[PDB]
């Protein structure tokens, strides 16, 4: 089941964006500390220590449900498994033998994974019925 990827999009790019900065964190976190972080958050205190990090700041032009939106298509497809026995803050991630060993070993140039569409693809679509009149509701008795 964790083998039969769903439809369609592949951004292998994305998944060492999220797999390389937990790696840097070493997972010891929930979810929160990483969303807010790849898309370059306002914080001089860990943009000195964890400077070298180049991650910072790429999911900026990402808006949050999208990064949300593609840690739920790693769920599913066995790439993550969260335990919510870990973080009081929220379940946290954590790599498995199948992830585990990507991060440990495609850290070099091995960007594979057709996935598994996000379910907010466009959320600017939100457009504003306009106001159609009913047909019904005719009556010219006072008029002509």
């Known amino acids: 089941m964790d083998d039969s990827e769903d439809t369609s ?13 937990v790696d840097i964190l070493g997972e010891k976190f929930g979810i929160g500390l990483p969303i807010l972080f790849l898309r370059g ?46 973080n009081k803050f929220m379940k946290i991630c954590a790599l498995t033998k199948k992830g585990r060993n990507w991060l440990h070993k495609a850290n070099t140039e091995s960007q594979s994974l057709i996935l598994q569409a996000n379910e907010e693809l466009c959320p600017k679509k939100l457009l504003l019925p306009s106001s159609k009149t009913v047909s019904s509701g005719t009556k010219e008795h006072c008029y002509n």
């Open 9 to 21: 999009w592949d951004f292998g790019p994305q998944a060492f964006k999220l797999l390389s900065a």
């Open 41 to 86: 958050s306002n914080s001089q205190r860990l943009a000195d220590q964890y400077r070298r990090h180049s991650l910072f700041g790429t999911g900026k032009d990402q808006t949050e449900s999208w990064w949300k939106a593609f840690s739920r298509q790693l769920i599913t497809e066995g790439f993550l498994v969260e335990v919510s026995r870990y």
